[PDB]
Design a protein around this ligand. Structure first.
Ligand SMILES: Nc1ncnc2c1ncn2[C@@H]1O[C@H](COP(=O)(O)OP(=O)(O)OP(=O)(O)O)[C@@H](O)[C@H]1O
Ligand SMILES: Nc1ncnc2c1ncn2[C@@H]1O[C@H](COP(=O)(O)OP(=O)(O)O)[C@@H](O)[C@H]1O
Ligand SMILES: [Mg+2]
Ligand SMILES: [Mg+2]
Lengths: 466, 477, 187, 81, 456, 128, 128
């Protein structure tokens, strides 16, 4: 079927077909373009007209231009031939190494796994970060979400999880960049080339990359997450592997939906967001799940507008995640890094029957003492430190020591801090926090715990203080 | 004729509905019979909504509107250097017509992943605080953020002036062409700034795009893109370009006005849903191109004004999430006389530590660590730490419109962090540094020249520096 | 392009198309022709066949406008009437046609000077007094008018008469009389 | 939240003027420990005052946000017709 | 061009033209009214209809009433014959003294001067007021936010600025009463008549008044500031002077703009302010500048809504303010007049690159000694008492007898130039007058008169 | 009428907030664009053109007078609302009553610190 | 079903905030007029005609009952929002959970101060 263009509003194009009106979610090609421009059908406006979301820039479009229905959704090449490449939203390789010669193509729109396919195994995933492993431990196959405002350390944390987990990984790995810095994508591509994970000369690459970044129009930013999902879904279903899916950033999917919903003629909901925010996020996030035919461990960065953690987008995302790590700016401005908030991060495996009663008691004690210190904050601020109880002074000292200890230097953060990155096993973390709780270090200065590895390095630094 | 011509149906709200133009393209520059120009924004089944790049007063209903056939573009090239143009590339300094022969679309896309390469070359700002603790490399996007009257435009002007020592040299690989886009500032401010740059003789390599406060909101919304295209010209030809959007808060305000006069759903603080894309597509075009594309680069210094030091607002956080760092200018620090009032505790450059020279790194890693200790403390050693930190913060203070070469800065920071000021009075460090620099530029041109050429501090140069600063310090008060 | 506005204005899309056709006809002097052909094409579009066809919301716009152009071109329409028809059609405003025609008819109801006036009384009148009353309410008119009497009967006013001539309105009925009596004797 | 902000700001105002009263009382009783109490309560009052200024900034921010949100609700309810 | 009113909704009138539509911002005269009612065009609605805001009440408008296009924006009468007179938003004399017999008119809607007409150097405007010239100088061509309201001598400061600028610089003044209470408008009119600022009997009046009061439709309260600015623009361009332009109040100008937009049905922005807030304020303020002919210096009374400086209206007018003059009531209770707060009054030309290192050094020294004086007064020794003595003498020397008050206290008027102010504060800071009594500086001119009074 | 014919009147609007509410309903039902708190764009115009008619004339016009005492009913001291802010901006002062003073024993519960008169001393006999 | 056959049931909606969000999407897409937080006008009706179906029948109808435990998620403890106030005003008492009590070691983190049971002691065994 061949239609013509009757309306162009930014990234939303209304096209009127004569006969053969394409169903919803089909891909359309615009004729007369230097590069490929795909329009995805979103509505049927009646009178043989449909509304579409463009997948690239829409400048130079003229009313009356031809459009050919492809007869199928946006299909992207899937398979092992996609490892070590970089594709955009519509599946074209943008790494300038030639076409992706894979055998089959999959559509980016698919139905979420059913109920009887869901798997409920909850083995722990040791990352090597003290705060994450202590208070909000991740799980294999679970969904991880890294909340945080602008400039608090989401990207550094994702690079650390790629360094600690995506390197020692057995299965495959997908990284879908959704509306973020392009130089970060270039740096990741080259840092993966050098480390042998992406191997440009033979067929032993272990990572596939999809990239629609913050320079792309809202259609590409809205559907590149779905493209990455499609790649990971192939690696999970058709090969039974264990996949890792790093999404950064997934708030841009909702934000692009919001940027297009104004033009699609819809009444705005709360905070200007689209009325279909929750169901869009649901039909996206329900595909990112570990079935019983495979497993997908997902780490999704999640921006937080104006540091508002009650904004509809993160507040809706919270329900979709198995473990949340909420970075805080009030903590990053204390110099603590990672800026994880120990009193806002949760996990579904923080249960004494899973992580062991000992790990559970340690985590709960840390959280309780930090919460008591947070309650004392105002008194300490106004009436000074010297008007507290002796037990309260003990808890304040221990809690500040625990605050410093929860920080840790990263192997990827050495470039702009110098310190050597540490990787603290779970046992060392549990032991060190048992010891700080028991008060076995109330003689060292708190400054000894700032930016160290395990507790041995803490006491070594405390000695070096003299 | 209703295919290359239209009639204005309804003007008002900064948008002109036009009947006709069946052959117009989206984002095409149409021309009104009033002499004005505009962009074809909305193409609807019966009318065309055109954004007007000027005063609506000049347009009546029924005016004929001709189309140019070209997507909105600006004239680029080296003929712009030393010219003050408006957001449409027209000379507003009365020095004749812009002799440009090439044009470039303002709405282009940023280079992808492959055409880029990591930032490696230094971009010398001339400010001790920036060059030492917040290093900026060619190809970065460093955000200058702070309250009103805290020193942002002064930092940008000091950078543009500092690039003079390179733009007179020999190797075309270190020269930097500067562009200063003014978005909603007072026009007297821009005139005085142009004069200040003409005195420092930094206009011969600078362009000034001015969409001031008395220009229509579409002009303030378009000026950043005109500037960024004038910079992309240099970037795509192996040359290096710096660009300062001063500032982006006022472009965001102009875009919010354009969006509300178009009846689009306002979001947080009544901002449109796409006030992020607005900036992102603009700050992603500042990139470092690899050698297979020319080796050129484009550095962006977006400016953001915060209300009551609040950095967790909507637009400030957007730009923090777009750029590659920030430079926090506090107002309390600016009140106590610290100038530039850079909060070195919150300022950061994620991709700059790979752009410092060897010598500046040799002194600045040390300096950063002692300043970190001084800041976190505020015993017998911590008193020494506070004394050294006070001396170093007094060493970071700097004049205005007097940027320092890299060798002079590394020499001063060396004299500072090597302990040779731990006995002097804090209130005298400023004059000590001034006199010290005068002495070193008088009797130590060879040491400065070899620190420059080497880009590093060898042990011979280290010893020379030690005995030089000790000879000067002994012969001091 | 300057437009010549009719003496009375109708609004909505109805009135917009009506005044567009009025000006397009007065610019080439075909008011009577387009008027009678409008009423006849309204009769044509209200025959159950095409009257049903014309509102069906899925019939293609191009196919339906060409079908209607075929059907109207056989009555030997002047170009202005078929122009109006094709404009209403490719603009999808066909269901409004008759309404527009009605407007246009009432449009001409003012071009000929036809002033509609009502003289409503208790019970139907005999036409001797009705003729002298035609004379009486034709007396107030200016140079060059024609009047249209539409008298209705209601015993609810229980006497008198009400003359609503255009916007002028005298209520000599005994209902308003007794209401005045009551409001005065109470105040 | 506007009302919770007023709650906390009234709490801090309460303890602020409490330490003001106690400072001036301990300064009356100053005609060693009493002088220390005077200076300590002076410092506590200045701390509570700077916290009041912080809370006033936050309150003004939240007030502007609330007015803007209610305007958006009104105009989006009116513009659906 | 003759059109007709087709709709009336409060203060918004839709007028349809048969031919020759008027461009936006023109003025239209409603025909057949007892008093002049001018409608200003705001949109072209289509079908040859325009939408307008009324400058006066719209009682008694009928659909189809004739309206005449004037072919130009609201043209007010400008000239020196405007001095001492009062006019409204459309230039009609509302002082009941007959027509304003000027020779030329001017449209209130003009463009800001070109880029090539600006002055490239900032320079100080000498107001002859010691505290204003020392601690918070006024930039010639800049905007000054005048804070403080009642009981702090604000109108006295206004009249003294008018008088000093007229005597020293030879440039007149304009006073735009945007959103005035009529009671306060009349009070200010009569105070100006008494103090000689206005002269109802000769041709030697110093100020021209323009009033749009609190009870006018929002269009009038929005455009009255442009009317006053047009009078001042004439004085700057065609006379070549250094004009003053007082704007009381500017928050009411912002509010009038917000109301005008809300009437036109535009979607409101943040905190309810018009979407075009920044551009309204910009197109107003960018006319107040220095040119190669003269200059316009604007003093604007700033009201801060809900004492919040982050509110969009202050935050938007602050971007254009080059200086600040804060009148405190505590400084008034201490007998200091002008009651200008010395530490809170700021400036943007307090810069050695502009005012020179000498002036900047003396001013920084005075600021430092006053700050340390407050620090010492926190306590209530060796030289602390010497700083206290010099600071008390500084406080006393900041006061000054205003000529506009000669009729009250009899004391003479003192217009202290910049050189003698600099030198006097330099000598008081150098310690040259550590022996004179502190009361020998209260209400004096230069330091010479201070030592003369110290004799007695 | 009295004010212009030489006599001295006094008028109490009890209260203006409810007149504003009535105007708001009228404007919303006349399909006029709402503003802040749904009030029309010109409620300040309403109250200011009502209140500026309370003037004090001169001897050349009759010497009459018309004192207005507009009343405003806030909600929990909320003088930062829309209509209270407008009427405070228009008037020549205020008399702030309180519920805390009304309970702590002060009746009339006038708050002396917040209340103000911008004319003040000019409107008193010499003894008072 | 169980309520009407002498058996006792207990239903738990988890939660109603998401049902209200789904209904708000359906309404805003059907072009119905939005209210607070863009919710439709009759979401209170939506929750009330659901929560009122929880009743205790008398022995003339079997004696069966139906207990309901609706769940509500507030944003940062804002129980003054639209849907939280609606469902609080509908039900017979709340069970407030806090996160500061949850991290102070109090688990279940029930805030006993704000938790009400309008039924009260009549819903307890004698000993308890
Ligand atoms: N390092 C400095 N030394 C001396 N003066 C300085 C310094 N930095 C800034 N200033 C002064 O502070 C004043 C304001 O600084 P500047 O205008 O450059 O920053 P800004 O943030 O752009 O201000 P605005 O918000 O008005 O645009 C200037 O007049 C300048 O002279
Ligand atoms: N582990 C860390 N150590 C020190 N600084 C860090 C660390 N993580 C983040 N940061 C700080 O955050 C900045 C980058 O964080 P990033 O993840 O890129 O922010 P965003 O959430 O916007 O992506 C760095 O410049 C650094 O200053
Ligand atoms: Mg990130
Ligand atoms: Mg600036």
């Amino acid at each position: 079927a061949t239609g013509r263009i009757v309306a162009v509003i930014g990234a939303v194009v209304d096209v009127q077909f004569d006969e053969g009106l394409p169903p919803i979610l089909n891909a359309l090609e615009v004729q007369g373009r230097e590069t490929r421009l795909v329009l995805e059908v979103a509505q049927h406006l009646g009178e043989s007209t449909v509304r579409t979301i463009a997948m690239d820039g829409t400048e130079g479009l003229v009313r009356g231009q031809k459009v050919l229905d492809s007869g199928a959704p946006i299909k992207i090449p899937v398979g092992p031939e996609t490892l070590g490449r970089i594709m955009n939203v519509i599946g074209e390789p943008i790494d300038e190494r030639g076409p992706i010669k894979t055998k089959q193509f999959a559509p980016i729109h698919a139905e979420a796994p059913e109920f009887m396919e869901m798997s409920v195994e909850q083995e722990i995933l040791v990352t090597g970060i003290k705060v994450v492993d202590l208070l909000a431990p991740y799980a294999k196959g679970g969904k991880i979400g890294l909340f945080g405002g602008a400039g608090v350390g989401k990207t550094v944390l994702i690079m650390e999880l790629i360094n600690n987990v995506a390197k020692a990984h057995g299965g495959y790995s997908v990284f879908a960049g959704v509306g973020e810095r392009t130089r970060e994508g270039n740096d990741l591509y080259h840092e993966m080339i050098e480390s042998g994970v992406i191997n440009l000369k033979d067929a032993t690459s272990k990572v596939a990359l999809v990239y629609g970044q913050m320079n792309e129009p809202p259609g590409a930013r809205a559907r590149v997450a779905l493209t990455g999902l499609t790649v990971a879904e192939y690696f999970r279903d058709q090969e039974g592997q264990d996949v890792l899916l790093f999404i950064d950033n997934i708030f841009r999917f909702t934000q692009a939906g919001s940027e297009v919903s104004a033009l699609l003629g819809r009444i705005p909901s709360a905070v200007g967001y689209q009325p279909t925010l929750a169901t869009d996020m649901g039909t996206m996030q329900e595909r990112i799940t570990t079935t019983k035919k495979g497993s997908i461990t997902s780490v999704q960065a999640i921006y937080v507008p104006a540091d508002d953690l009650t904004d509809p987008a993160p507040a809706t995302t919270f329900a979709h995640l198995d473990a949340t790590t909420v970075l805080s700016r009030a903590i990053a401005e204390l110099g603590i890094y990672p800026a994880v908030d120990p009193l806002d991060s949760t996990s579904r495996i923080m249960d004494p029957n899973i992580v062991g009663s000992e790990h559970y008691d340690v985590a709960r004690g840390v959280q309780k003492i930090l919460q008591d210190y947070k309650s004392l904050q105002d008194i300490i601020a106004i009436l000074g430190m010297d008007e507290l109880s002796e037990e309260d002074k003990l808890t304040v000292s221990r809690a500040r020591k625990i605050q410093r200890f929860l920080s840790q230097p990263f192997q990827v953060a050495e470039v702009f801090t110098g310190h050597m990155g540490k990787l603290v096993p779970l046992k060392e973390t549990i032991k060190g926090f048992q010891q700080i709780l028991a008060g076995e270090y109330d003689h060292l200065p708190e400054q000894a715990f700032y930016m160290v590895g395990p507790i041995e390095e803490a006491v070594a630094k405390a000695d070096k203080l003299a | 004729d209703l295919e290359e011509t239209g009639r204005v149906l309804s003007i008002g709200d900064g948008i002109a509905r036009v009947h006709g133009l069946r052959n117009v393209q989206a984002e095409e520059m149409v021309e009104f019979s009033s002499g004005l120009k505009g962009m074809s924004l909305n193409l609807e089944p019966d009318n065309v909504g055109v954004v007007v790049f000027g005063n609506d007063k000049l347009i009546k209903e029924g005016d004929i509107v001709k189309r140019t056939g070209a997507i909105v573009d600006v004239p680029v090239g080296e003929e712009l250097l030393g010219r003050v143009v408006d957001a449409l590339g027209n000379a507003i300094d009365g020095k004749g017509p812009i002799g440009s022969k090439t044009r470039r679309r303002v709405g282009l896309k940023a280079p992808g992943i492959i055409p880029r390469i990591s930032v490696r070359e230094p971009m010398q700002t001339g400010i001790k605080a920036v060059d030492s603790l917040v290093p900026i490399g060619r190809g970065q996007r460093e955000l200058i953020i702070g309250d009103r009257q805290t020193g942002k435009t002064s930092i940008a002007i000091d950078t543009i002036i500092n690039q003079k020592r390179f733009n007179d040299g020999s190797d075309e690989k270190k020269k930097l062409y500067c562009i200063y886009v003014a978005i909603g500032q007072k026009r007297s401010t821009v005139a005085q700034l142009v004069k200040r740059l003409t005195d420092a003789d930094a206009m011969k390599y600078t362009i000034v795009v001015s969409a001031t406060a008395s220009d229509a909101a579409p002009l303030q919304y378009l000026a950043p893109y005109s500037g960024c295209s004038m910079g992309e010209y240099f970037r795509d030809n192996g040359k290096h370009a710096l660009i300062i959007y001063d500032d982006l808060s006022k472009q965001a305000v102009a875009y919010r006005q354009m969006s509300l006069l178009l009846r689009r759903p306002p979001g947080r603080e009544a901002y449109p849903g796409d006030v992020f894309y607005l900036h992102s597509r603009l700050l992603e075009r500042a990139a470092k191109m690899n050698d297979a594309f020319g080796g050129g680069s484009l550095t962006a210094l977006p400016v953001i004004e915060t209300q009551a030091g609040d950095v967790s607002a909507y637009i400030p956080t957007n730009v923090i999430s777009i750029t590659d760092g920030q430079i926090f200018l506090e107002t309390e620090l600016f009140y106590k006389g610290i100038r530039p009032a850079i909060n070195v505790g919150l300022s950061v450059s994620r991709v700059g530590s790979a752009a410092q020279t060897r010598a500046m790194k040799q002194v600045a890693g040390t300096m950063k660590l002692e300043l970190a200790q001084y800041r976190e403390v505020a015993d017998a050693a911590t008193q020494q730490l506070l004394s050294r930190g006070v001396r170093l913060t007094e060493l970071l203070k700097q004049g205005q419109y007097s940027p320092m070469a890299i060798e002079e800065q590394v020499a001063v920071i060396y004299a500072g962090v090597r302990g040779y000021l731990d006995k002097l009075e804090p209130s005298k460090i400023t004059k000590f540094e001034n006199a010290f620099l005068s002495h070193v530029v008088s009797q130590h041109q060879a040491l400065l020249g070899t620190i420059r050429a080497d880009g590093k501090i060898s042990e011979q140069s280290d010893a020379k520096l030690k005995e030089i600063v000790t000879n000067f310090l002994a012969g001091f008060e | 392009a300057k437009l010549v506005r009719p003496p009375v204005q109708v609004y909505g899309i109805e009135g917009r198309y009506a005044t567009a056709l009025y000006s397009a006809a007065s610019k080439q002097n075909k008011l009577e022709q387009v008027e009678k052909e409008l009423l006849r094409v309204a009769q044509i579009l209200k025959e159950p066949k095409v009257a049903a066809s014309v509102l069906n919301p899925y019939v293609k716009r191009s196919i339906k406008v060409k079908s209607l152009n075929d059907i109207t071109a056989k009555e030997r329409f002047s170009p202005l009437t078929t122009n109006l028809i094709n404009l209403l059609a490719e603009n999808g405003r066909l269901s409004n046609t008759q309404g527009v025609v009605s407007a246009f008819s009432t449009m001409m109801s003012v071009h000929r000077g036809e002033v509609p006036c009502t003289v409503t009384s208790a019970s139907p009148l005999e036409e001797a007094t009705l003729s002298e009353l035609k004379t009486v309410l034709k007396s107030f008119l200016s140079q060059g008018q024609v009047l249209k009497l539409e008298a209705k009967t209601d015993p609810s006013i229980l006497g008198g008469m009400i003359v609503r001539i255009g916007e002028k309105y005298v209520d000599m009925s005994v209902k308003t009389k007794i209401q005045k009596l009551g409001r005065a004797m109470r105040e | 939240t506007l009302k919770d902000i007023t709650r906390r700001l009234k709490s801090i105002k309460n303890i602020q003027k409490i330490t003001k009263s106690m400072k001036m009382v301990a300064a009356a009783k100053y005609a060693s420990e009493q002088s220390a109490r005077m200076t300590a309560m002076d410092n506590a009052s200045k701390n509570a005052s700077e916290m009041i200024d912080k809370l006033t900034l936050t309150f003004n921010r939240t007030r502007q946000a609330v007015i803007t949100k209610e305007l958006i609700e009104i105009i989006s309810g009116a513009a659906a017709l």
